Write a protein that binds this ligand. Sequence first.
Ligand SMILES: [Ca+2]
Ligand SMILES: [Ca+2]
Ligand SMILES: [Ca+2]
Ligand SMILES: [Ca+2]
Ligand SMILES: [Ca+2]
Ligand SMILES: [Ca+2]
Ligand SMILES: [Ca+2]
Ligand SMILES: [Ca+2]
Ligand SMILES: [Ca+2]
Ligand SMILES: [Ca+2]
Lengths: 378, 378, 378, 378, 378
Amino acid sequence: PPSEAEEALIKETRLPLTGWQQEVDQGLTYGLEAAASIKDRSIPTFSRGELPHYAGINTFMKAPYLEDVREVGKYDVAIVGVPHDSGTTYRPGTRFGPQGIRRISALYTPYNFEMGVDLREQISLCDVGDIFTIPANNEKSFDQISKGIAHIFSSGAFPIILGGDHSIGFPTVRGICRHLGDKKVGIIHFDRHVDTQETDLDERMHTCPWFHATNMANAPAKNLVQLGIGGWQVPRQGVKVCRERATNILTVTDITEMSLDAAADFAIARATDGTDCVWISFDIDCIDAGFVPGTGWPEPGGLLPREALYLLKRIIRETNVCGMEVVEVSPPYDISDMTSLMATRVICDTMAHLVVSGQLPRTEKPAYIHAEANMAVD
Amino acid sequence: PPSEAEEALIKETRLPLTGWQQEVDQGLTYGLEAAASIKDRSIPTFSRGELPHYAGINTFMKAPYLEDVREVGKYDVAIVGVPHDSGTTYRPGTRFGPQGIRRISALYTPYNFEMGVDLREQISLCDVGDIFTIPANNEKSFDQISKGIAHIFSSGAFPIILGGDHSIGFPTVRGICRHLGDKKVGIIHFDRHVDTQETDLDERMHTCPWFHATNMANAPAKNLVQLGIGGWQVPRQGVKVCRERATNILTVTDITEMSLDAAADFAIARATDGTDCVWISFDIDCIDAGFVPGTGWPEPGGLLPREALYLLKRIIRETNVCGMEVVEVSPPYDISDMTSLMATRVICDTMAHLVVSGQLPRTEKPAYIHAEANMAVD
Amino acid sequence: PPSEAEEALIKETRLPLTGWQQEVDQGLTYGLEAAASIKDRSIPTFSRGELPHYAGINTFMKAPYLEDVREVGKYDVAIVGVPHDSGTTYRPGTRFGPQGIRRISALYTPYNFEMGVDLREQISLCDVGDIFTIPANNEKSFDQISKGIAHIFSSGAFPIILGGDHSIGFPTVRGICRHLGDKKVGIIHFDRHVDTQETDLDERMHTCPWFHATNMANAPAKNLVQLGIGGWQVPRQGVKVCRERATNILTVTDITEMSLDAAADFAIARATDGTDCVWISFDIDCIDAGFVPGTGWPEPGGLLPREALYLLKRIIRETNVCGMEVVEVSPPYDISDMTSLMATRVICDTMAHLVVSGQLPRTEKPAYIHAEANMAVD
Amino acid sequence: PPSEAEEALIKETRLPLTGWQQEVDQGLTYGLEAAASIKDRSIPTFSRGELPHYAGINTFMKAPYLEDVREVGKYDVAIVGVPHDSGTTYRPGTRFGPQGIRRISALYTPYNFEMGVDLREQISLCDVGDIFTIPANNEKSFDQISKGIAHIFSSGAFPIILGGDHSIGFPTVRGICRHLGDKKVGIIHFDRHVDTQETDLDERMHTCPWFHATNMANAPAKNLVQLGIGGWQVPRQGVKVCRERATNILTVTDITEMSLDAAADFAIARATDGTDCVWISFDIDCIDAGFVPGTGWPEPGGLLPREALYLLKRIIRETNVCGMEVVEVSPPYDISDMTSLMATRVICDTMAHLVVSGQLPRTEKPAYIHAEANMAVD
Amino acid sequence: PPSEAEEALIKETRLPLTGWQQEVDQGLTYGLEAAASIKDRSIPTFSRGELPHYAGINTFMKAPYLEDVREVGKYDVAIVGVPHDSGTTYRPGTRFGPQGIRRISALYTPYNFEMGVDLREQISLCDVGDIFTIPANNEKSFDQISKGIAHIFSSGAFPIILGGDHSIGFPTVRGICRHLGDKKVGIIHFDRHVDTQETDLDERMHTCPWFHATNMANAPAKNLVQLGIGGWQVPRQGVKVCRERATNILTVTDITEMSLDAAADFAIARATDGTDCVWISFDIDCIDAGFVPGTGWPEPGGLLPREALYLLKRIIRETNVCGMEVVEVSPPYDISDMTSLMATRVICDTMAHLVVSGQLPRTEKPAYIHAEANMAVD
Ligand SMILES: [Ca+2]
Ligand SMILES: [Ca+2]
Ligand SMILES: [Ca+2]
Ligand SMILES: [Ca+2]
Ligand SMILES: [Ca+2]
Ligand SMILES: [Ca+2]
Ligand SMILES: [Ca+2]
Ligand SMILES: [Ca+2]
Ligand SMILES: [Ca+2]
Ligand SMILES: [Ca+2]
C-alpha cells in the first residue's frame, strides 16, 4: 500500500490555485505592488492576505471579517467568537479564548498535508467577530449567544464557535434548536467533566449546560455522548443526572482499552440513533493538562493530542454535523498560546474532515434547518 | 484658578456625540439588535464597534481597517504597522510590536479626560495594517517601508508608525523626504541611544538610522534633537558622528536639572531652526527600564512616564509635526502588555495634542507635501 | 531635629513583646518543641505563627482565621475577601485578588519601622475568609457582599475588603449604609477612573459603583473625592455624572502641581464637610501601570508609590475612617505578586495610620453604627 | 534476559574515572583547595568544572571553551552555536537557541545511565562559541555559517550545530559539501515541515534550505529523508518540490502505524542508498507542541519524546554520521528552558550513540573529508 | 555652562581605541577572518569579543574568564559570583543571581556616555567565575566565600561580588578583614532592611550579616551606614541591635526630604570617620519593588533608580572603596532580566566612578592590604 505521505503528495496535485491567485491579485491592488528591489512580484507593499504570517490584522486564519452579519449565509463556514467567562467556577480568562485562537491561527496555512485539503480553495470562510457578551449577567449573555448562533445557523452557514466557557453549550445548542423544528440533535461532548448538573453557585454555569440543553425536546439526553469523563472534578450532582437520563459515557481508560476505533464506533452509533444531526462540543480540558495549561479545569491523565484528533477524524467524517464549539481556552493561564494552538488544530481539522466527507461546501440548505425561530424551545 | 479636573469637566460638555451615535447605529444594523432581555437598546447582538473592550477584531483603537490603501488620503490619521526586527542587535521580537500595540489599545476609549479630546468625534482615523516586511533582507524591508510611508504621507493622511526596531527611522524618514521637495524636516528623537553610526554587524541596523537619514539633504543633522541620551549602550561610533555633525543632545540628567520646560524649549528651538516640519521618533527604551521590560535595549535611569508625556505636550503642540513613529516595543519580553501600553499612550496623547493645537484635522494639504516622489533623495 | 530613622529607633523601644511571646508559647504547645539540634527554643517542630515566612497556611498576615463569623465583633480589624470579577469590562482575574494579597502578605512582619507600630502588639486582627460571590450574577453577588460587610461593620470590627473589581464599591458602601441610620459617609476614592456611570454592558459594573452608592441618602455625591482621575479610559458617561452631581476631583497633574499636602487638605476638607465618617476605596490602578501590571485597567502616568502612600498618611490620620477596600488586583496578569504587594502595603499602612491616630483599637462602638439594618437604604 | 537497568549497572563498572580525576585535579590547582571546614577535599574554593551544576560559566555541558578555533581539529566533537533568526517566518527568538541550550545543559552530567557512556571519559569535547551571524542580511549570515562549519568539518572534529532557525540547513550542509569532493551526503531531516521551497518572503528562509542544498551535486534529493511531515503549516510550494525531486517522507501516522523500527529501517535504507555519510538535521518542532513551546512553528500531534529518541538510537548507530544540527529552539517563547532541554537531550543522546556504535572517537579522518574547499559547490 | 551632553562628546574624544583594536585583532586571529561577502573586515567568522551582543559565552561584560585564580592579582578588577541562597528567609533563587547578571550584562558596551569612561580602554577586568557554595550548609558556604574573597582582596585586584543573598555580607567582609591588619572598614549598606540581628531560623541568615561582621574589631558598627531602611520587613530584633550599637540610618523619606546631596554627605562622613576604607554592600531590594521584581524581599516605596545611582556617584567618588557586593537578585522571580539589569548598572557605574575618581587602576597596593591572613578576625 502507499503511505500517507505518498498519498498526500498525489492529493496536493489535485488542488487548484485560483483562491491563492485571487488573494495575491487583490493584495496587489489594495496593498500596491512591492518596492522595486523585491523580486517576487506577488508580494505587495502592504501586507494584504496570508503573508507575512507574523503581520496583519488577526481574524481567524486571516479570513475576511464579515462586518455585515446579515450576509453570513453567503459563506460556507462562519467563525464566531463567544467571549464569555461568567460561567467559570474556578479560573476566569476564557473570555479571551477567541482572541488567543485568532492570534495563533496566523501560524497556519489554509492547507492540510495529510488530508489534501486547502480551505482557501475548497470553501468560503468568514469571521463574523464576537457575540456582545454580558459579563455581569450570565443569562443575558446566554440570550445574546442564542440569538447570534440562531442567526448564523438559520442562514445555512456552518457555525464554528470559539469559546468561552462550557456554559455556552446551552445557549449555542438552544440557538440551533430554535431552527430545528421537530428534528433531533445528538451532542458529542469531549470533556473530562459531565457538565450535566442543574445549578452551580446558584446559576447555570459551565457544569450545567447539558442539564438545560437536554431539557429541550430537540436534544435527547439518550443521544448525548460524553468522551473522556474522569478525574477528581466530575461533580457528583452531574453524575446523578447522567445516570438518571441515561447518557452515554466513556472514560479515558475505556477509550484506550477498547481502541480508538471502537470508541468512535460507540460515539457515532449512540449520537446518531434517532437523531438527524450532531453537535460537536469540544472542551479543551479533555486533553491531558500537560498540553493545555491555559484552561480553567486542567486534569492529568486526559487524552493525548493524536488520540483526540483521531477520534475527530472518525466522528466528523461519519456523522452529519450541524455545528461545533471549542470551549475553555483561557489565554491568561497559557504559555506561548499552546492551548489556543491545540484548539485551532481541532477547528481546522474539523473543517478538513467536513470537506473530505463531502459535507462542505453544501449544495443546498440541510433538511433540518427551519427558517422560523421557535422561541419556546426552552 | 480652576484645576485641570474642573476644566476637564467643562471641556467634556463641548464634545459632540454624533460619532458615537454613528457607531451605535452601524453596530445595530450590521450586528443586529440585541436579544430581548437586554435593556440598553444601543447594544447589538454581535459586537461591532468599541464595546465590549475585551471583544472583537483588534485594529488600533478598533479603528476601521482600510483594506484599500489607495483611499488612505480620505482619513486624517493612518496607523501603519512596520513589523520589522532585522535591525535588532540584541533581542528580536519587535516585529510583533504592532500586534501588541493593537491588542492593548482595545483598553482605551477615544476620549482623553484632561485634554477634552474625543478622537471618535474630532478626527477620522484608519488602520491600514502592516507593511510587508522582509525579515531576511533589511534593505529590501527598508524599500517596502519607504514606499508605504511615502504613499501615506503624500496622500495627506498623518502617518503614525508602529514599530518595529529603530532601523526603520531611516526608511520612514526617507519615505517622507521623497515628498518634501527641497523642504527640510527636523527630527526629534527620544532615546537613550544616539542611533547615528554608519554600520553595525555589517548592515544599517537600529544603531544607524540617523547617519543615513541626515545624509539626505532634506534632514539636517544640525536639526536632529536627541532627548535622553545616556547609559552604557551608547556606541562610541555614534557619539563620534553626533560630535562631527553637531547634533543637539540632552541627557536625562540635563533634562531633569534644567527643568522639563527648558528641555522642551531647547528641543523646539533646535528642531525648528531652518526646518519646515518635524518628525517625531520615539524609542520606547527612553523610558526607564522598570516601565518598559518588553524592549531590546532596556536601560535603568531613563525618563519617568509623566516626564516623557509632558515633554510631548510641549513639543507636539508647538511644532508642525509631519508624522511620528514609536519603535522598539518587543512583546515577547513584555509582561501583560505593559510596554505596548506605554507606546499606545504616547501615540494617543500625540493625536490629542495635534487636535488641541489645531494641526488635525487638516483643512488643506500642508505646503511641504509634494506629489511627485523624488526617488533620488538618498 | 531628629531624623525619621532616629525617631523610629526610639519608638521601637516603646513597643511591648507580649503578643510575640503569646504566639511563641502557643506555637510550642500546638507545634511541639523543636528537635534537639535546634538552639533557639522559641522554634517549634511544626510552623505555627509568623515563622518561617515561606511556610504555613496563608491567611492575611497569618492572622487567625475566624471560622465562626458571628464572633467577628471581638476583633479590632476583620480582613474580608471579596473574590468578585463579574464587574470587569476588560480583563477578569481579580476574583483571585484576595488570594494573591494573602499569599504575598506572608513576606511582612507585623511591625512598621518608620511609624513604630506593631500590629501583633497593638490590635487584634482576624481573617474571616471570603464572601461567597456569585460569578454568573453580579446582582446576587452584590447582595452577598452587602450582607457580609453589614455584618462585620455592625459588629464594631473595622472592615478591610480585599477585592475584587471596583463594582463592589456599591455593595460594600451599601452594607455600611444599612447601619448608618441617618449619618453620612464621605467616600475618598483613589483611581484614574471616575466609576460614576449608570450602567456598562447593561449592568452595574466596575465603572458604575458611585452612581448607585451616591443615590443613597447616606452617601452624598458632594462629599465624593476622586484622586488621580485621568488618561484615556475615563468614560464620558461617568464624567457627565461627576459634573452634574458636583463630585470633587483632582487629576494626577493637579496633585503633583498643588503639592501632596494641598491635595490631601482638599480631600480631607471635601470628604468630611457634612459627613460623620469616611470610606476609603483604593483602586490599585491609580498607581502608574509600571508598578501594578496585575490589574484590569492599567494606565501610564499615575501616582508613584511614595505619592499614594503619603496621601494615605495625611488622609487616614486626619479623618474618621469607617472602613476600606482595595480593589482590582488581578494576579493572573501580575509578575511575582508585585501588584498584590502594593495592595498589601496600602492595607498595612492604613492599619498603622489608624493606630498612630488613635482610631484603633476602639474603646467603644462609634456613634454612627446602628444595630438594626435599614434594608431600604437603596 | 537481563533488564536494561541490570545491563546499565554492569556497563558503569567498565567506565574509567581518569577524566573525572583530571578535572578534579585541575579544579584544585586553578580554584584552590577548599576552606578548612569542607570535608570532601575534591572540592575547590572556586567552582572549576562540573560542580556545582547551578554555578559557573555556561559553555555546553561545561566543556572547555576553545578560544583559538584553529586548534579545533584536536577535539573529537566541537559544539558550535549559530545564533541566526533571519530565516524565521513567524516568531523570531531562535537567535538565542544556543544560549538556552548552553544554560540548561549545566543540569546534565557527562554520563548516560542506560547506554553506559561517559563523555568526560570517552571523548574530547569543546565549545567553540558562536558564528558571528548577520541579522540584517540572511545571505551574509549564510556565508559566515558555511565558512565556520567548513573549518570545523575539515579539521576532523565532529560538528554539532546549535541553531538557529532551519534556514541554516543550507549553509551548514554547504560548508560540509565544500569538503566532500565528489562524495555524497544523505540528509535525515526530523520535522513537521518539508523545508523544500525556493523562496519565502523573497528570500531563502527556514522553509527553503533543502531546495538549495539538494541543488548541490553532493546532496541528492533522492536521499533526503523527511520524518514527521504533517499538519497545517507544510507549504504547498514545498510539497511540489518534494514530489518533483522524489524525496522520502513519512508522516507521524505513517511512523506510528508502521512501527518505529520499520520507520527507522526506511530512513536508514533511503538515506544511505548511494551516499557516503549522513547529515542529521533535527527541527525541535517535530516534537509535539506540548513539549516544545519555545519554538517558532509549534504543531500538535507530533512525535512524543521517547519516539523521537528511539528513532535516533536506530538511525545514529546504523549510519555514518558526518554532523548534526538541532534547530528552532526559541527561548523567549519557552517555559523554564523546557524546549532547550529537549534539544540538549537530542544532542547528548546523539553523542552517546556515536560512542556506542564506535564512530567516536575517530582513529583517522574519514575518507570523505577533503582538505581543499570547493567554493563552487553551490 | 556646558551641558552634560556637551561634556560627554568632548570626553569621548579623549578615550583611546587600543583596547578595542586589541580585541578586534585577537578576534580575527582566533575566530578567523570573515567570509568574503562581509564588508567590515574587523568582523571574524566566529564571534570572539563583544560582538554580536546576543552571541557568545557570557562572562560578566564578556570579560576574560580567568581560569587560574592564582593570577588574579594581574587584574585591576575581578568579578566573582557567590551563588548562595542558603540565607534566604522567604524566596530562594538568588543562587542564580550571578548567572542573570552575567547574561544581561552582554547588552552593555564597556563605555559610559555621561562619564566618558571606557572600561575596555582604562582598566583590566576579569571574571573569575563563582565560589563553590554549599547549599546544605550556610556556614561551610561562608567559609568558602571568605577564603575566595580574601584571596582576591589580598592580590590587589578590586573585588566585585555578584550575590547571592545578603547573608554573604558577613563572609565577604570577613575575607577582607583577614587582610586588613588593624585597619578599619566602614560599611555603606543600601537596603530597606537593617540586616543586624543575631540569628534567624536558628542560623546566620540574610537578616544577620552585620551583627556578625561588626563583632569583628576591623568593622566598627559606629561606621555602619544604612541607607533606605523602612517598610514592614525590618525585624524588630535588628532594630534593637542598630540602636544599641549606634549604627547610622536614613530612611527613604529622610533621604528625599534632606536632599540626595545631604544624604550622601551623611553617609560619607559617618562611614569614613575613623576608618581607612569603605565596603559597599548594595541590596537590590533598596530600589522600589516596581523596578526589581526578581528579589526575595521586595518592598514598595523604595529608592527610584536615578536616586540610588546619584547616591553612588557621590559616595564612590568621595571614599576609598575596598570592594563591593550587589546582592539579592533572584532571576526565577524576574521579568526579562529587569532586576539583573539594575544590578549590572550599579556594578558598571561603580567601576566608572572608581575610574573618574582615580581609584582604578591602582598604581600600588593600598596601604591597608596585609599579605598574611588573620584567621582569628572572627
Ligand atoms: Ca466542559
Ligand atoms: Ca471540562
Ligand atoms: Ca533608538
Ligand atoms: Ca534606544
Ligand atoms: Ca475603580
Ligand atoms: Ca480604575
Ligand atoms: Ca524545519
Ligand atoms: Ca519545522
Ligand atoms: Ca539586605
Ligand atoms: Ca533587603
